[PDB]
Design an enzyme around this catalytic site. Structure first.
Site, mmCIF file in Angstrom:
data_model
loop_
_atom_site.group_PDB
_atom_site.id
_atom_site.type_symbol
_atom_site.label_atom_id
_atom_site.label_comp_id
_atom_site.label_asym_id
_atom_site.label_seq_id
_atom_site.Cartn_x
_atom_site.Cartn_y
_atom_site.Cartn_z
ATOM 1 N N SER A 104 0.863 -1.171 0.000
ATOM 2 C CA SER A 104 0.000 0.000 0.000
ATOM 3 C C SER A 104 0.903 1.225 0.000
ATOM 4 O O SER A 104 2.101 1.130 0.268
ATOM 5 C CB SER A 104 -0.911 0.006 1.234
ATOM 6 O OG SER A 104 -0.150 -0.195 2.431
ATOM 7 N N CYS A 150 1.679 2.002 -13.378
ATOM 8 C CA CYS A 150 0.997 2.576 -12.230
ATOM 9 C C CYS A 150 1.760 3.771 -11.674
ATOM 10 O O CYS A 150 1.159 4.795 -11.342
ATOM 11 C CB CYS A 150 0.784 1.510 -11.169
ATOM 12 S SG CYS A 150 -0.437 0.284 -11.647
#
Ligand SMILES: CCCCCCCC/C=C\CCCCCCCC(=O)O[C@H](COC(=O)CCCCCCCCCCC)COP(=O)(O)OCCN
Ligand SMILES: CCCCCCCC/C=C\CCCCCCCC(=O)O[C@H](COC(=O)CCCCCCCCCCC)COP(=O)(O)OCCN
EC number: 2.1.1.79
Lengths: 348, 348
Positions: free
Chosen positions: A104, A320
């Protein structure tokens, strides 16, 4: 031909040369690439990369430039319309992630390395929750238990973690041995309890927008009256089916990103929105850190994976990273309550 | 009778006694009060107060308790349904407000008086905007020019203020003499310029939700590509016609509060939401500060107003303070951009 001309024209608007030498330029080894990418979009771009049809020294820079220029939109209409109509192991993660196994976004405001950045992110979560001794905290989507570990160790609280992976349950239990932590293997929607605080990291993206109303109803059911809820999630700048075909096929089959409007509309009847923090640019730094560590670790894991996997995973991390650098996708931490008296000065 | 029983039962759920002596208790002088309030709702409560039908030592505490208990909702259904279907001068403001004439929420995180709290709020606006020398800033709804004054004086920027009041224009020009400030008297929707930064305080509440799309389109038209926009507005926790009948009749005839969802939906196609700050609890402190100063100043202005005005203005300030204390209404500062590279660490 027309495929080459169209592709060359789009890429030049982003400052990308075909067969150039600059870091973000691309080198094309199979000339069928141009047609494939224009007909197949995101999927053709990523699958052709995996197939070895092209190379790029800095895919993160490529994607940042491509997305800043909005080439996915400048595409000729008859291409866009056609498109609209349409595993990882602990040997890898233990080396790529930090000691708390945070898959994360980290918080780089004052950190210069991944490990410090993840501790700062964990500390910020705990400080936003305003934890006091004796509180019971629910962690929806606890993963390998790094957050439960961090908060039970550093604050005098009980933690209940919820996960869907039987493997993650076990590693989380082992990590948290000696702490007042319980890891449940069940569906969060079956929870009927009362917690002082609730936190959720990186599972809302898999709930799906049709189920946002249920999600916030479940959180409400499980939150004590004066409780506080922190939602941590990647976010889209647009309200729709925010699903990238390539990511969906190879990385996150249930992934769909929420918009601010969707979170606002689903949470409205349940909670006051107390604070909304966007540090999406930090996910760029996080992803590049993971990419660096993935590369260093590759000799030790190559045998358990393939070269095609390496290309896929390289494309995933760098695309990403570029999408976050271009500010196309966001990283939100939202603090919710039912309207606590005197409000909240939410930590940064 | 039934009116008295119903009212007494509702008020007891909020801890309020009829004809009691506690600070938030009410003393009723005209027994028609109970029927009037149950039939006429918010309007009957406030108008009966102005008519002298009841008294209360701490109206702010009364409204905080009433709203926390949600009595406007616990009302019997046949009352609610019927309801759903349905000036100030510079002598007053110069004494009630702070030296920067901020008729808007202050920031009490580190201040213990109104004047310091307003400077901290002004400084926070400027720091969130990340002002650099030579920038041109648009202030939509500039009022008496305190914010333009503060930011031109303290940062090396040009300011264009826009107002609808010819009186406020003049006082703003006088206040900002010697500074690179222009105060325009016009409709903001006619602006077609390019600013490095845009700020708007306390005019969005009068735009009306049907015009939110136009509002954000106007801001977008006037914001340079890498610009930043700060929106400061009172907010509702619910998406609807958020209009209180009494406020609408006596204070803010065009006022209607936005929800998070409405701001999110209207701003989505134009801007990335970079940061959302809620300090509604500070508006309670601000309003009580103004009330204190209004009372001290009353001897000097009594002749230009009436006792009925005093009761009206007392009710306004204290009911609003209680609504913020109960966390029923919110105070938001939202920072928007088009996705600035490297993101924003938005000041607190
Ligand atoms: C749904 C995600 C579920 C995430 C679950 C989070 C769990 C937390 C753990 C790990 C997450 C780390 C990585 C997060 C990546 C986020 C997923 C993602 O990239 O979202 C994609 C963008 O894809 C891209 O960046 C690909 C780039 C776009 C390619 C377009 C090229 C075609 C045009 C070129 C023509 C010449 C969809 O974004 P939209 O809002 O639709 O735009
Ligand atoms: C529309 C506002 C426009 C504002 C423009 C802002 C410009 C900035 C300058 C000055 C503003 C300072 C004061 C701000 C006050 C905000 C306005 C306001 O109070 O909003 C009212 C609440 O009213 C109340 O607090 C009244 C209390 C409710 C009374 C209910 C009693 C009836 C039930 C009792 C039965 C026994 C509507 O709130 P909703 O979301 O509908 O709830």
């Amino acid at each position: 031909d027309n495929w080459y001309r169209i592709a060359n024209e789009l890429l030049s608007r982003a400052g990308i040369a075909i067969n150039g030498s600059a870091p973000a330029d691309i080198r094309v080894k199979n000339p069928d690439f141009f047609k494939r990418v224009l007909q197949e979009g995101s999927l053709g771009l990523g699958e052709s990369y995996m197939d070895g049809w092209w190379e790029c020294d800095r895919l993160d820079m490529f994607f940042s430039k491509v997305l800043r220029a909005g080439l996915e939109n400048q595409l000729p209409h008859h291409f866009k319309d056609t498109l609209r109509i349409a595993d990882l192991g602990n040997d890898l993660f233990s080396r790529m992630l930090d000691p708390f196994m945070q898959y994360s976004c980290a918080y780089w405001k004052d950190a210069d390395n991944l490990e410090s950045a993840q501790q700062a992110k964990l500390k910020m979560i705990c400080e936003k929750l305003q934890l006091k001794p004796g509180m019971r905290v629910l962690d929806i989507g606890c993963g390998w238990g790094g957050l439960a570990h961090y908060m039970a160790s550093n604050y005098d609280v009980s933690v209940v973690g919820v996960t869907i992976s039987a493997e993650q349950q076990k590693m989380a239990q082992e990590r948290c041995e000696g702490l007042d932590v319980t890891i449940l293997l069940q569906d969060y929607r079956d929870l009927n309890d009362q917690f002082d605080r609730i936190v959720s990291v990186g599972m809302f993206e898999h709930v799906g927008p049709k189920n946002y109303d249920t999600y916030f109803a479940v959180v409400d059911r499980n939150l004590k009256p004066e409780g506080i809820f922190l939602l941590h999630t990647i976010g889209s700048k647009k309200t729709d089916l925010n699903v990238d075909p390539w990511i969906n096929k190879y990385i996150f089959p249930n992934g769909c990103l929420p918009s601010v409007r969707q979170i606002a509309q689903s949470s409205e009847p349940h909670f006051v929105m107390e604070d909304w923090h966007n540090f999406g640019a930090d996910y760029d730094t996080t992803l590049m850190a993971w990419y660096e560590r993935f590369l260093a670790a590759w000799p030790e894991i190559a045998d358990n994976y393939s070269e095609r996997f390496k290309r896929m995973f390289t494309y995933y991390l760098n695309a990403c990273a570029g999408a976050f650098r271009a500010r196309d996708i966001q990283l939100w931490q939202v603090v919710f309550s039912r309207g606590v008296e005197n409000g909240l000065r939410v930590a940064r």
